[PDB]
């Protein structure tokens, strides 16, 4: 089997991407944030504290003839940005772009933190990291990909995120029309539960390539590109007036600037992030100070190849017995 679904930016900055997901019988369609950096599929629901729902579409398990309460199961998660959610668990039928999993753990939110409440466009998350990170207790649950894997034509899914435009998540096949040149595959460590890999270096603008190992994770659920402070400093030094602002919480730059590209290495291959991809607009409405799309990972404890990086590539998440990651230009 295969699946194919369009993923759409939630706003004009590509702060995140939502993908429609069918849950239950009859189908309840929710727009979820596909997140290769976590492993819980959770949703706003009829059980969510009413004051914490503000415009989201909710899953109502009582209206699904295939929903079953997973007795005794609870979940609770906290994300790298400080947000969190928690609740109980159903199993139900979940389909993505024509691909159907029966008995998928659907984690029903009883509580969500303010940032989820405040984002009306995201109805929940669909985790696509390794199932070892799933928070369900006392019986850990499998991700949608993990449940679908055996049925898929090929044990893979691909992320093709658009810049200021829709893109595609595919399951079970590689669309050879969706990228240019060849796909370069690179080793993955699953030891931390992430799609963790090692980039072979970087360049800033038309600058020479610096060969250097950068360990990080491919994380569709993180907006920006988080790299070591040395790297990030080298980038922003090429932008007149750019500075790190502790009050804003990162590198800012004059909105009048033309940003240079940023290249990262995948083996011997190179992915180029256009400078425009690195502009996240005024820090506040009307400001002429703009927020940078490349930020320091110092104090996160891990480098993160988030949407800024991944949207410049066609990315293969290969879930074979020994997982690997593939990157192609597009």
From Swiss-Prot:
The active site of this protein is located at: 35, 199
Enzyme Commission identifier(s): 3.4.23.22
One GO term of the biological process aspect = proteolysis
Disulfide topology: 255-290
Where in this chain does the record put each Peptidase A1 domain? 17-328
Query: What does it catalyze?
Result: Hydrolysis of proteins with specificity similar to that of pepsin A, prefers hydrophobic residues at P1 and P1', but does not cleave 14-Ala-|-Leu-15 in the B chain of insulin or Z-Glu-Tyr. Clots milk
Per UniProt, the keywords (alphabetical) are:
Aspartyl protease, Disulfide bond, Hydrolase, Protease, Signal, Zymogen
Would you say which domain of life the source belongs to?
Eukaryota
Q: GO molecular function terms here? A: aspartic-type endopeptidase activity
Q: Which family does it belong to?
A: Belongs to the peptidase A1 family.
Protein name per its UniProtKB record: Endothiapepsin
Upper classification of the source organism reads: Eukaryota, Fungi, Dikarya, Ascomycota, Pezizomycotina
Gene for this protein?
A: EAPA
Shown stretch of the complete protein: 90 to 419 of 419
């Amino acid at each position: 089997s295969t699946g194919s679904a369009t993923t759409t930016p939630i706003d004009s900055l590509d702060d995140a991407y939502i993908t429609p997901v069918q849950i239950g019988t009859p189908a309840q369609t929710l727009n979820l944030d596909f997140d290769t950096g976590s492993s819980d599929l959770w949703v706003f629901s009829s059980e969510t504290t009413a004051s914490e729902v503000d415009g989201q579409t909710i899953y109502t398990p009582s209206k699904s003839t295939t929903a079953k309460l997973l007795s005794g199961a609870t979940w609770s998660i906290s994300y790298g940005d400080g947000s969190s959610s928690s609740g109980d668990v159903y199993t139900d039928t979940v389909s993505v772009g024509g691909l159907t999993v029966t008995g998928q753990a659907v984690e029903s939110a009883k509580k969500v933190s303010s940032s989820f409440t405040e984002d009306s466009t995201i109805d929940g998350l669909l985790g696509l990291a390794f199932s070892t990170l799933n928070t369900v207790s006392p019986t850990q649950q499998k991700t949608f990909f993990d449940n679908a894997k055996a049925s898929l034509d090929s044990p893979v899914f691909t992320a093709d995120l658009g810049y200021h435009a829709p893109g595609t998540y595919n399951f079970g096949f590689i669309d050879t029309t969706a990228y240019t040149g060849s796909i370069t595959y690179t080793a993955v460590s699953t030891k931390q539960g992430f799609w963790e890999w090692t980039s072979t270096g970087y360049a800033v603008g038309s600058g020479t390539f610096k060969s250097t190992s950068i360990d990080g994770i491919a994380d569709t659920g993180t907006t920006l590109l988080y790299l070591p402070a040395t790297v990030v400093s080298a980038y922003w030094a090429q932008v007149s007036g750019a500075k790190s602002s502790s009050s804003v919480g990162g590198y800012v730059f004059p909105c009048s600037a033309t940003l240079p590209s940023f290249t990262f290495g995948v083996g011997s291959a190179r992915i180029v992030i256009p400078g425009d991809y690195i502009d996240f607009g005024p820090i506040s409405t009307g400001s002429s100070s703009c927020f940078g799309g490349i930020q320091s990972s110092a104090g996160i404890g891990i480098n993160i190849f988030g949407d800024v990086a991944l949207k410049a590539a066609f990315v293969v998440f290969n879930g074979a017995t020994t997982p690997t990651l593939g990157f192609a230009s597009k």
